[PDB]
Amino acid sequence: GFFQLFRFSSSTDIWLMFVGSLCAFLHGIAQPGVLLIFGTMTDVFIDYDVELQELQIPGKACVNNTIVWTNSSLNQNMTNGTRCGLLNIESEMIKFASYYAGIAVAVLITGYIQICFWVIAAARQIQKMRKFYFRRIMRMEIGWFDCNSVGELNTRFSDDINKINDAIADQMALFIQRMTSTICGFLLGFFRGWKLTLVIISVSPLIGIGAATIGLSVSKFTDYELKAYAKAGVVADEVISSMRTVAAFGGEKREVERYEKNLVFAQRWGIRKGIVMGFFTGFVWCLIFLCYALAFWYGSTLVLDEGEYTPGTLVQIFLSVIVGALNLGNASPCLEAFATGRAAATSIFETIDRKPIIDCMSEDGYKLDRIKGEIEFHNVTFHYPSRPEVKILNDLNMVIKPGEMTALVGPSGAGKSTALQLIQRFYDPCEGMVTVDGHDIRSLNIQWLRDQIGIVEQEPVLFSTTIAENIRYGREDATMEDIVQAAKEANAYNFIMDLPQQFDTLVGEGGGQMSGGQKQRVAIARALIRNPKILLLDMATSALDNESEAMVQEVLSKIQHGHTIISVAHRLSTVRAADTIIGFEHGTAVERGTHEELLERKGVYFTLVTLQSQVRRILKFSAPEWPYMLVGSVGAAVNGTVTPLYAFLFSQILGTFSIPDKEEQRSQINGVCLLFVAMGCVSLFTQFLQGYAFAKSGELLTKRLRKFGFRAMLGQDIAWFDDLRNSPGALTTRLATDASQVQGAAGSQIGMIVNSFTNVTVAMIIAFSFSWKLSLVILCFFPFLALSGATQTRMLTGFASRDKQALEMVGQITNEALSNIRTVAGIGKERRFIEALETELEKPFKTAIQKANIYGFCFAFAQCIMFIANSASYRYGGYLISNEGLHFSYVFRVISAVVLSATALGRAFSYTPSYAKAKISAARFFQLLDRQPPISVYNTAGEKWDNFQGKIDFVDCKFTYPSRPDSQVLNGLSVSISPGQTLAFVGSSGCGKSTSIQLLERFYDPDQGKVMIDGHDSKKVNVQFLRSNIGIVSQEPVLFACSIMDNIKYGDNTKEIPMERVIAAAKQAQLHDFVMSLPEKYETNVGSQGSQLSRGEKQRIAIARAIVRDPKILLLDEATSALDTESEKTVQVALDKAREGRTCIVIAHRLSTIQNADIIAVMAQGVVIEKGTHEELMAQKGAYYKLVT
Ligand SMILES: C[C@H](CCC(=O)NCCS(=O)(=O)O)[C@H]1CC[C@H]2[C@@H]3[C@H](O)C[C@@H]4C[C@H](O)CC[C@]4(C)[C@H]3C[C@H](O)[C@]12C
Ligand SMILES: C[C@H](CCC(=O)NCCS(=O)(=O)O)[C@H]1CC[C@H]2[C@@H]3[C@H](O)C[C@@H]4C[C@H](O)CC[C@]4(C)[C@H]3C[C@H](O)[C@]12C
């Protein structure tokens, strides 16, 4: 519902929203209410000019000029005596100039209450809706998190509640003043004259449809432009990310064709954005100017003869129906903000109240002292609440006698993580209650249950604090003398001394965190500090480095002793010294014995061991765009004069109700309300042209500035893609958003700087030609009105709404308590993370009570400055009607041409992309285009034409990784070759040998120690002619968003694009029978949407992508890392076939790949020591000799 968004309001938060309600009803009557003054004020100007200029003729009775020449100082001689000083102008303008000055004060102080008492009174609810939501989201099960994301529960905390902030706070008071001004705008048009407002009201829904689709079409075309660019920004976001393989196959010159062709969709919603917002700006415009010629043409007849409308109330019923039909349609961009919020709060308001099964309640249970360490599982059966169509635990039965160890052993997945997880009560058994020393796991306090058990996880995860209270989370009572007791027994005390500081070393997450073998040593102290009676460690040393494996398993196996331990094993050589291994095969704990009762029986421990335990820059660049920017700047000089030519002409029709002969008010008033018809029906056209051409110039620019941008980003060094800051998740935001900022320094500045030069010139010239002594009063208020035109269209600096970067500290304390929810529930309490959010949630609240009276202020001073500009300048205008002798038509033409072009000179300076961020956004593309990287594909290709035959010979290759500071030395070595053999590097692990063959292409170059191709050097061997003859294969395979054949097709775009060699390399590369076992012949699309392949049998595409070429050197760099050796043997047949006449370098990490082939040189320092074939690894140690020793 919608009025259910107002729930979380205390009693002091419904009165703070009610004095803002009747100050938004009371501000919202002054916009048609001030027409009551201007109605009756242009009638006292015009009842004075009649008796002035009728006295300006010595005509009819000159012995008594009707009344005038002092016939009021007599006694009773005035039978018609109105033509005297009855109508004193100067004493009447003071009776009007203090009418505006009262509205100016009573709209400054109610335009401040209505928008300070709705941003305060609705940034006080969200501090309570973003707080109940996080308190009940932590009391869920663990099962509710298994079918919800982390990234979906983190846009429903900062991106979704920021939509029911926009519906409650700002757009509600600023709605109800746009609704009580379109009620009083029509009703104060009826009560004056009923028949003269009924004709205008028939076109009044046509002026309001057209002005409700300008506001509703700015914030609705950003749904399309994100959804019409990203059909093409998913092509150049999967080439920059997979950048190693587009280089080595040479598809640089053609990949930008598949991005240029996909790009015109952004070129089409850009041109149909400056038409719809362009044409409908004219269709409002024309319909105002054609409506002035309907209330002054047919409205003249009623005031010309009828007489039942003085000409004041002919411009007062008319200007109040117009201003009550703009404000009707203008309340539609905020009647969208109500329904965006209403539809998007159904997910928050559901999660606030669910009351699920297990939680943090301290009532319903039986707290039980003296647990004797009894664990019992009755006959259970279990289902995950994500994939419920399986019985994971199939009728389990196990007992755990207290005192000593207990194992739990499976083949590969039998009771991997679920069987150890029921006992600390994360999930519930649907049958078979499980019990601990009497009564079962339910009917107990969960706060009591989770204090005995202490778990050691698979992976170590640590919170962002320091190592003092990263241990103190378990059992908060314990002291600094007592933490170190567990910090030594877990063997971190020798890490306490050798540390840059003691007990405050902020290396939790925002510091330099250490290795997993010394992160696992922190969690043991968290589990020992609480004095537990149960232990549970589930593959503790699983994802870490095996050097640490020795010392951390000594702490579990030998140091820990004294009570129950239920510990599974990463490998069974550790769990041999056990009490009762209760391992199993499927679902039911079958063995229940030691290794000697299974010396005669099968089990899964006596089974498994036999197979495992055996600016001028822009305009010159926008060169072909001279026709559109010229027709767009002739059409921007005609609708820049329509703002000061209206004011020259409205005061013309407002003066010719003071021409004395009654017939002249039928043909002078008709030949001026005919110029409005030629002013609307032109500005319906030229407003369209000024919007069409400038959304075609700067659109066809920014389609072309992406094509030149994406080529000169593609063909460069590999050594700056892997630079630190411009990572491929943040380079394609420089090419999506940042390439449209340049549009505001060529195309659209011309439509502001010539739409202002023929605006604030023709307005001054009309102003200064008539009354230069009145034009200097109102021109003092001139800068303060361009602020009321730049705020009327509303993105003034004064919104202060880019304080999202104070919600990032809130957005990190909510992520490190929800992305690791396994280790918060099972360890200690989540009570601190429902006290470390609610502390932190003050700093965005204080910056939404400091914004609530700056946007509160500058909304009112940009609303009371026109009403005081007419107060100090109609006042002085009456000083000149009566004393200095000018006409009354020359006040309306001077006071209204510098304010009618003072609001339009600031309304057009907010509809233009700013210029500060467009003179530097085009200053980083113009350096990206004009950049000369030292190695690149686009070079004029020389230094070529050598018949290769793979004679690639190394001489002392010292290397650095000269971009990323990984080391200062990578291993220098020198290996020669003859064509047809192997280099076969095996040895060190970290960046020593694989760098040297990632060096092999034109990727990196040696600073020293130059290499040869055929006696040449790889600074004077070109990139294009070398790379035709290599063949690489990578570690992670990557296949593009195409079919099976098309990636096989992708191997060579250099030649005539082959079909003939796919058949010859189908049965060679061992895919000829898997390409026939498919749902379709070759159109199996495996990119992003179809059924995904296995990496173990995607390698067979990754090898086969190379061999469609005619390579002279292979680069078999680190394939075949599939963890199932059945599928490894399938591709191991495939690597053996890509040989017999081709140079190879195969690293062969798993040593069964080929051994007797050729030399083995690299080592830990990588020095060439063994230039020898495989028979020389007996007297000196080699690859196989180390693992057998
Ligand atoms: C009629 C309005 C003036 C009354 C007013 O001040 N309302 C309160 C201001 S708000 O609640 O804070 O927006 C103004 C404000 C916004 C104006 C519109 C917007 O500026 C959008 C375009 C701008 C074009 O230059 C003219 C047509 C137009 C479609 C404008 C017509 C008209 O002058 C509007 C509708
Ligand atoms: C007259 C209307 C209300 C403001 C006003 O001038 N009232 C005079 C009384 S007082 O001084 O406030 O006392 C305003 C509101 C919207 C305005 C119109 C819109 O801004 C659209 C265009 C804008 C062009 O610059 C001028 C013509 C015009 C068609 C405007 C004429 C006039 O200024 C309108 C109709």
> What is the residue-wise DSSP string for 931-982?
---SS-TTS---S-----TT--B-----B--SSS-S-S-B--------SS-B
What residues form DSSP beta bridges with 534?
Answer: 453, 564
Burial of 316 (0-12, 13-18, 19+ CB in 10 A): buried
For the four alpha carbons of 51, 55, 57 and 59, in that order, the dihedral sign comes to positive
**Alpha carbon distance 30, 33 (integer Å):** 4
Using DSSP's 3-state secondary structure scheme, residue 407 falls into strand
Which among 165, 889, 832, 759 has a CA at the least distance from the CA of 463? 832
Which among 287, 547, 219, 568 has a CA at the least distance from the CA of 412? 568
**Is residue 114 in contact with ligand 1, taking CB distance under 6 Å?**
no
Rounded distance from Cα 785 to ligand 2 centre (Å): 14
* CATH no. of 375-581: 3.40.50.300
Rounded distance from Cα 18 to ligand 1 centre (Å): 27
Both structure tokens of 1075: 């390409």
Q: Output the furthest CA–CA distance in the chain (Å, rounded).
A: 147
Q: String of b and e for 568-592 (b: at least 16 CB within 10 Å)?
A: bbbebebbeebebbbbbbebebbbe
Residue 429 DSSP symbol: -
**Is residue 326 in contact with ligand 1, taking CB distance under 6 Å?**
yes
Using DSSP's 3-state secondary structure scheme, residue 460 falls into coil
Using DSSP's 3-state secondary structure scheme, residue 1188 falls into helix
Burial of 691 (0-12, 13-18, 19+ CB in 10 A): buried
**Alpha carbon distance 378, 433 (integer Å):** 6
Which among 741, 746, 750, 744 has a CA at the least distance from the CA of 924? 741
Both structure tokens of 496: 């306490």
**Alpha carbon distance 1053, 1050 (integer Å):** 7
- Residue 226: φ, ψ to 5°: -70, -35
Both structure tokens of 535: 């232990």
**Alpha carbon distance 196, 296 (integer Å):** 10
Both structure tokens of 847: 């910056």
Q: Which atom of ligand 2 is nearest to the CA of 319?
A: 1
Rounded distance from Cα 322 to ligand 2 centre (Å): 9
**Is residue 643 in contact with ligand 2, taking CB distance under 6 Å?**
yes
Q: Which atom of ligand 1 is nearest to the CA of 859?
A: 12
987 annotated to bind ligand? yes
Rounded distance from Cα 220 to ligand 2 centre (Å): 27
Both structure tokens of 650: 């409205």
**Alpha carbon distance 633, 753 (integer Å):** 10
**Alpha carbon distance 993, 1006 (integer Å):** 14
Question: Is the distance from CB of 408 to CB of 566 less than 8 angstroms?
Answer: yes
**Alpha carbon distance 824, 818 (integer Å):** 9
Amino acid present at 500: P
Pairing outcome for strands 453-456 and 534-537: parallel
Sequence-ordered list of residues with C-beta below 8 angstroms from that of 52, at least 6 positions apart, any chain: none
C-beta contacts of 206-211 below 8 A and 24+ residues apart: 206/287, 207/284, 207/287, 207/288, 207/291, 207/322, 207/325, 207/326, 207/329, 208/325, 208/326, 208/328, 208/329, 209/329, 210/280, 210/283, 210/284, 210/287, 210/329, 211/284, 211/325, 211/326, 211/329, 211/330
Indicate the top mutation candidate among 31, 646, 871, 891 to test ligand 2's pocket, ranked by most ligand atoms within 8 A of CB. Answer: 646
Query: What stretch of H or E contains 400?
Result: strand 394-400
**Is residue 30 in contact with ligand 1, taking CB distance under 6 Å?**
no
Both structure tokens of 833: 């993370």
Indicate the top mutation candidate among 103, 170, 178, 284 to test ligand 1's pocket, ranked by most ligand atoms within 8 A of CB. Answer: 284
709 annotated to bind ligand? no
320 annotated to bind ligand? no
Rounded distance from Cα 1133 to ligand 2 centre (Å): 82
Angle (CA) 547-548-553 rounded to 5° is 125
**Alpha carbon distance 1074, 1066 (integer Å):** 9
Both structure tokens of 136: 């009940």
**Is residue 676 in contact with ligand 2, taking CB distance under 6 Å?**
no
What residues form DSSP beta bridges with 564?
Answer: 534
Residue 168 DSSP symbol: I
Angle (CA) 179-185-187 rounded to 5° is 105
Burial of 134 (0-12, 13-18, 19+ CB in 10 A): buried
Both structure tokens of 1090: 């179809």
Q: Which atom of ligand 1 is nearest to the CA of 793?
A: 20
**Alpha carbon distance 1063, 1042 (integer Å):** 19
Burial of 222 (0-12, 13-18, 19+ CB in 10 A): exposed
**Alpha carbon distance 230, 557 (integer Å):** 55
**Cβ count within 10 A of residue 432:** 17
**Is residue 1004 in contact with ligand 2, taking CB distance under 6 Å?**
no
User: SS3 helix, strand, coil % of the chain, rounded to 5?
Assistant: 35, 5, 60
Task: List Cα–Cα distances, 124 to 588, 591, 639, 852, 963, in angstroms.
Answer: 55, 61, 46, 12, 49
Burial of 132 (0-12, 13-18, 19+ CB in 10 A): middle
**Is residue 181 in contact with ligand 2, taking CB distance under 6 Å?**
no
**Is residue 860 in contact with ligand 1, taking CB distance under 6 Å?**
no
Amino acid present at 640: G
**Alpha carbon distance 1162, 1140 (integer Å):** 24
Both structure tokens of 1183: 């690859």
Amino acid present at 813: I
**Alpha carbon distance 408, 418 (integer Å):** 12
Pairing outcome for strands 1030-1033 and 375-381: unpaired
Question: Is the distance from CB of 392 to CB of 422 less than 8 angstroms?
Answer: no
**Alpha carbon distance 1135, 1154 (integer Å):** 10
**Cβ count within 10 A of residue 545:** 11
**Is residue 541 in contact with ligand 2, taking CB distance under 6 Å?**
no
Rounded distance from Cα 203 to ligand 1 centre (Å): 18
Both structure tokens of 874: 């109609």
Sequence-ordered list of residues with C-beta below 8 angstroms from that of 886, at least 6 positions apart, any chain: 770, 771, 880
Ligand 1: residue whose CA is nearest its atom 32: 326
Q: Which residue has the tokens 């002969």?
A: 661
Q: Which residue has the tokens 């604030």?
A: 760
Question: Is the distance from CB of 326 to CB of 207 less than 8 angstroms?
Answer: yes
**Alpha carbon distance 588, 584 (integer Å):** 6
Burial of 973 (0-12, 13-18, 19+ CB in 10 A): buried
**Alpha carbon distance 595, 607 (integer Å):** 11
Both structure tokens of 1095: 């990496």
Amino acid present at 397: N
Both structure tokens of 1118: 């680190």
Q: State the ligand closest to the CA atom of 218.
A: 1
- What resolution, expressed in A, was reported for this entry? 3.7
Rounded distance from Cα 792 to ligand 1 centre (Å): 7
Pairing outcome for strands 375-381 and 394-400: antiparallel
Both structure tokens of 437: 């020393």
**Alpha carbon distance 1026, 944 (integer Å):** 8
Task: List Cα–Cα distances, 866 to 40, 96, 320, 638, 904, in angstroms.
Answer: 19, 15, 17, 26, 13
Question: Is the distance from CB of 555 to CB of 497 less than 8 angstroms?
Answer: no
Question: Is the distance from CB of 953 to CB of 1146 less than 8 angstroms?
Answer: no
- Residue 620: φ, ψ to 5°: -70, -35
**Cβ count within 10 A of residue 804:** 11
Using DSSP's 3-state secondary structure scheme, residue 1103 falls into helix
Amino acid present at 661: D
For the four alpha carbons of 412, 418, 424 and 430, in that order, the dihedral sign comes to negative
**Alpha carbon distance 769, 765 (integer Å):** 6
Residue 875 DSSP symbol: H
Which among 813, 837, 142 has a CA at the least distance from the CA of 450? 142
510 annotated to bind ligand? no
Residue 1093 DSSP symbol: P
- The half-sphere exposure of 227 on its side-chain side, counting CA atoms within 13 A, is 5
Amino acid present at 185: G
**Alpha carbon distance 33, 188 (integer Å):** 8
Which among 705, 440, 456 has a CA at the least distance from the CA of 557? 456
Which among 338, 352, 325 has a CA at the least distance from the CA of 140? 352
**Is residue 174 in contact with ligand 1, taking CB distance under 6 Å?**
yes
**Is residue 319 in contact with ligand 2, taking CB distance under 6 Å?**
yes
**Alpha carbon distance 699, 268 (integer Å):** 9
Does residue 1012 come out as left (phi exceeding 0), alpha (psi in the -120 to 50 range) or beta?
Answer: beta
Ligand 2: residue whose CA is nearest its atom 33: 900
Q: Which atom of ligand 1 is nearest to the CA of 178?
A: 11
**Alpha carbon distance 723, 965 (integer Å):** 10
Q: Which atom of ligand 1 is nearest to the CA of 329?
A: 35
Both structure tokens of 855: 């946007």
Sequence-ordered list of residues with C-beta below 8 angstroms from that of 862, at least 6 positions apart, any chain: 787, 788, 791, 792, 796
Sequence-ordered list of residues with C-beta below 8 angstroms from that of 532, at least 6 positions apart, any chain: 452, 453, 454, 563
Sequence-ordered list of residues with C-beta below 8 angstroms from that of 665, at least 6 positions apart, any chain: 300, 304, 656, 657, 659
**Is residue 196 in contact with ligand 2, taking CB distance under 6 Å?**
no
Residues present in the chain in total: 1189
**Alpha carbon distance 217, 273 (integer Å):** 8
**Cβ count within 10 A of residue 1181:** 12
**Is residue 322 in contact with ligand 2, taking CB distance under 6 Å?**
yes
Both structure tokens of 641: 């004069």
Using DSSP's 3-state secondary structure scheme, residue 376 falls into strand
Residue 911 DSSP symbol: S
Question: Is the distance from CB of 9 to CB of 16 less than 8 angstroms?
Answer: no
**Cβ count within 10 A of residue 807:** 19
C-beta contacts of 796-802 below 8 A and 24+ residues apart: 796/858, 796/862, 796/910, 798/854, 798/855, 798/858, 798/859, 799/855, 800/847, 800/851, 800/854, 800/855, 801/851
Which among 277, 286, 283, 282 has a CA at the least distance from the CA of 695? 277
Question: Is the distance from CB of 654 to CB of 889 less than 8 angstroms?
Answer: yes
Task: List Cα–Cα distances, 223 to 165, 857, 1036, 1076, 1122, in angstroms.
Answer: 20, 32, 36, 43, 43
Rounded distance from Cα 288 to ligand 2 centre (Å): 9
Amino acid present at 393: L
**Alpha carbon distance 1000, 1011 (integer Å):** 9
Note the Cα 772 to chain centre separation in Å.
53
Note the Cα 685 to chain centre separation in Å.
38
Pairing outcome for strands 534-537 and 394-400: unpaired
Q: Which atom of ligand 1 is nearest to the CA of 863?
A: 6
Question: Is the distance from CB of 668 to CB of 656 less than 8 angstroms?
Answer: yes
**Alpha carbon distance 140, 354 (integer Å):** 9
Rounded distance from Cα 327 to ligand 1 centre (Å): 8
Rounded distance from Cα 896 to ligand 2 centre (Å): 10
Strand segments (E) across 1034-1127: 1113-1116
Question: Is the distance from CB of 905 to CB of 789 less than 8 angstroms?
Answer: yes
Using DSSP's 3-state secondary structure scheme, residue 1062 falls into helix
Indicate the top mutation candidate among 170, 174, 907 to test ligand 1's pocket, ranked by most ligand atoms within 8 A of CB. Answer: 907
Burial of 1041 (0-12, 13-18, 19+ CB in 10 A): middle
Q: State the ligand closest to the CA atom of 34.
A: 2
